[PDB]
Write a protein that binds this ligand. Structure first.
Ligand SMILES: OC[C@H]1O[C@@H](O)[C@H](O)[C@@H](O)[C@@H]1O
Ligand SMILES: OC[C@H]1O[C@@H](O)[C@H](O)[C@@H](O)[C@@H]1O
Lengths: 449, 451
């Protein structure tokens, strides 16, 4: 078997602003929802915050050198809205925007394609105080913010993501409250999901007016497999699938919301103006897939609101975040996504990776992470399998370039292919990163044998 | 001591309720969704899954309840208006059917000889405004003033005593700091901002009342006095933090004293400085002030008890109500003296809520409800009011919380504060022994308490 990838297939690594940057008040940056959330007791594992993180705002030069050592062809990163427009709407902060301006120039100088994400979960607190994703005006606030970046980086950043993972934003931030802004309401979740979709479409429209390049959304899909042949379990599987995988994809594709959501959300479900769905389905140029695992849901009448719960798949390895390792499901998901998007929408895996225990410091200058290595090589082979089945896949970004703050789980969950000692800020390339650099250099051939 | 309890001329006796706790009919006649409609229909938030969807069915049954007021000899009825009934989206269109309910209620009260005492806000923000940030959005002061105007004009000459905000501390401490009440946020950052905007909204409503209203307007504060747990300095510092956060946070800015210095210690990095013009707005002169009072606390140091780092020491020497609150009537006298001092002695006060929760059976027994501890609480706390008047406090009335057993917010129907029992299975009302005594207190203007 040859694992050589297609001509032009793009290899990179990914991060997010709050998870790596630190410097939360630097250069006139505004407060974000995560600045508040992480400083509230009880919310974060071990009381961890992103105040320092990987100190990447100050260490970006060294990190670009690391990218070159890994042979990266692209770097996927998010822009902190609060840095650029501290009050969310109104005055631009030139100092905060300058950080991204120098970063982007550094990447281009290194021969690395900059892939920017507008929103990776760090709403400015000033907009949260005005209702955040619950305020329908956020579509316009978000389009205006996007315009700042589309214009500033015109001709430099050519591949743009609007929203990273609408499901986590809404399920975590509004439905269950495990993530900022920490609300727990089905009523709110329904509305916030709708405004996230509208903001995406408004940003795409603004991009057509002023931008240059290709724009799209980034979704996470967690494929749902049958727990049994019982009808009540199939219904549970459908509910879980509708709420997690189809909630955003169907309206993006012009199919309206899944019918199952009226069952899942009950009296919290709402209907919206027709014109909203035209906005939401504004044509995009590509779509990103964030992918990590599958689930096997069974009926669970007390598991609000989907009334489903995953059955632990004890036959397989599980990561430190408790996610099953099952590479065939990545191939299956790419195939499904290709079917659902009509097969003519270019796809990229914009995040894939795995968390395993690593010590807090390098040992003899190394970090040996054989299960992360195994996950990496088996999932990249699964990608190649998907390409062989007609999926128009154009790139792969490893989550993550660096160990970082895994949101409410804190620094306890390491996804980096490069280790960060959070005490010293020393970076150490892990064995997974060493392998990945060779996958890129050989364009996959290293996996043959 | 030979003690007598006749009250001053014109001292006003009544009972109090709040819209969400009694009305039911949450979607009737064009009413808009409120934050409590959402909160109560979210699993885990309410004891037993109780909601206000029906409550005491007062939206339908209000005429019966007015007859009950008459049997109690009430001179006044303190009630709240549901914002989202009157202005379903919080701003914009006024709902005439929703406003008509309060219109008929006010006329019914006047015809019965009962003074209507209306509260603009008793915790039921329209959900359309919560979706725009609710008390975190500075524009809420203006939205609230516009809502006030609708009522000030509609009831001009009929409702003459007005309350703006019922208990800022409960709204913010419960709704934004700890999340136990709607809208269920848990953030010191948000609590600091919400408290400031609740104050600004009060000030804006008073300014609007000066322009379009007729009568007397004021805010209603809850105070829970904090007493020393020990002689340890760490416990006195804890007492000061608890007292600043609960009792002075709102009162000091209302009186032009700024925020308590202790709040920088309690809220730390969540604390914010605000523009001077805001404090001008907050301190807009009022005509009267309401005190909601139930109990005291004896705080000790508790480093893990966020954010005040204090916790109450159980006072096992005294009775406690079903809500776990100590029964200690001298602290009512003490608080009224303190509040009089801390308002300069020139602001008329009324006790706008006072009362107690005790177990009652779910149905009347031979047409009665015998509630001797609620009777005890009532008569000893009314005496304590009289003691405060004797110390020079300008107290002008007393409203019993509550006219009716009702939905005790997130504690549900399990905590009964009524002087009238409600059988929630049948909607039958039965005046309790506490209500029967109260009726005689009013009739005798206190004299019954002598014997
Ligand atoms: O949970 C692991 C990762 O999941 C991804 O979808 C998110 O975009 C990352 O921010 C996150 O760290
Ligand atoms: O908790 C007992 C009572 O406290 C009062 O201060 C509130 O205004 C009522 O709504 C509540 O039922």
């Amino acid at each position: 078997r040859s694992y050589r990838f297609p001509e032009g297939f793009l290899w990179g690594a990914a991060t997010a602003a709050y998870q790596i940057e630190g410097s939360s008040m630097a250069d006139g940056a505004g407060e974000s929802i995560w600045d508040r959330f992480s400083h509230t007791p009880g919310n974060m594992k071990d009381g961890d915050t992103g105040d320092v993180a990987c100190d990447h705002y100050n260490r970006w030069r060294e990190d670009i050198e690391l990218m070159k050592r890994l042979n990266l062809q692209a770097y996927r990163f998010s822009v902190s809205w609060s840095r650029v427009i501290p009050q969310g709407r109104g005055a631009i902060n030139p100092k905060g925007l300058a950080f991204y301006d120098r970063l982007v120039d550094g990447l281009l100088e290194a021969g690395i394609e900059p892939l920017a994400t507008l929103y990776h979960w760090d709403l400015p607190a000033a907009l949260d105080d005005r209702g955040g994703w619950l305020n329908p005006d956020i579509a316009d606030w978000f389009a205006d913010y996007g315009q700042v970046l589309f214009e500033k980086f015109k001709g430099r950043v050519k591949t743009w993501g609007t929203i990273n993972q609408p499901w986590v934003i809404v399920d975590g931030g509004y439905l269950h409250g495990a993530l900022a802004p920490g609300h727990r309401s089905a009523y709110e979740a329904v509305i916030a999901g709708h405004n996230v979709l509208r903001a995406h479409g408004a940003a795409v429209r603004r991009f057509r007016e002023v931008g240059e390049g290709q724009i799209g959304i980034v979704l996470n899909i967690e494929p749902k497999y049958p727990a049994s042949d019982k009808p009540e379990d199939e219904a549970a599987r459908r509910r879980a699938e509708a709420q997690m995988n189809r909630w955003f994809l169907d309206p993006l594709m012009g199919r309206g919301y899944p019918e199952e959501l009226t069952d899942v959300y009950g009296a919290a479900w709402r209907e919206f103006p027709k014109e909203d769905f035209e906005l939401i389905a504004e044509p995009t140029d590509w779509m990103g897939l964030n992918w990590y695992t599958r689930a096997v849901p069974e009926n669970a009448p007390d598991a609000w609101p989907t009334r489903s719960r995953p059955v632990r798949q004890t036959q397989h390895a599980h990561t430190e975040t408790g996610w099953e390792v099952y590479p065939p499901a990545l191939t299956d998901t790419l195939v499904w996504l290709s079917e659902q998007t009509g097969g003519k929408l270019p796809l990229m895996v914009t995040e894939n990776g795995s968390a395993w225990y690593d010590p807090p410091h390098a040992i003899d200058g190394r970090i040996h992470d054989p299960m992360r290595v195994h996950y990496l090589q088996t999932h990249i082979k699964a990608l190649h399998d998907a390409i062989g089945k007609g999926v128009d896949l154009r790139g792969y970004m490893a989550w993550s370039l660096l160990d970082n703050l895994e949101w409410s789980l804190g620094y306890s969950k390491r996804f980096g292919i490069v280790h960060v000692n959070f005490a010293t800020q020393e970076r150490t390339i892990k064995d997974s990163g060493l392998l990945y650099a060779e996958v890129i250099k050989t364009h996959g051939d290293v996996l043959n044998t």
